[PDB]
């Protein structure tokens, strides 16, 4: 909005940190079932806890 509270800004920050894709060294771990992050949120489609 460009007029944020601090509460909201911090919320957004964490959401922004969560988006990154898996580190590829994770795929090489021993008992690995994970191939892709599957919790990736694109701003244009799917619109936050808000």
């Amino acid at each position: 909005s460009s007029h944020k509270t601090f509460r909201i800004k911090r919320f957004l920050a964490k959401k922004q940190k969560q988006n990154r894709p898996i580190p590829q060294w994770i795929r090489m771990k021993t008992g690995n079932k994970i191939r892709y992050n599957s919790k990736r949120r694109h701003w244009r489609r799917t619109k936050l806890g808000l």
Partner: protein, 59 residues
């Protein structure tokens, strides 16, 4: 710098002075959209920033 989010400019100023034996003109904080309070810290004109920068490691 990156600074702890709870800090006042007063605290930062006092920290910067304490750690690096330095002295500050002014501190000028903001908050990164990421979460880490950044701090621009103007040193007083008796001091050169590149000289301290070399002391602390960065360049």
């Amino acid at each position: 710098f990156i600074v702890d989010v709870k800090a006042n400019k007063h605290q930062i100023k006092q920290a910067v002075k304490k750690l690096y034996d330095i002295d500050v003109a002014k501190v000028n904080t903001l908050i990164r959209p990421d979460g880490e309070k950044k701090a621009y810290v103007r040193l007083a004109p008796d001091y050169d920033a590149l000289d301290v920068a070399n002391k602390i490691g960065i360049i």
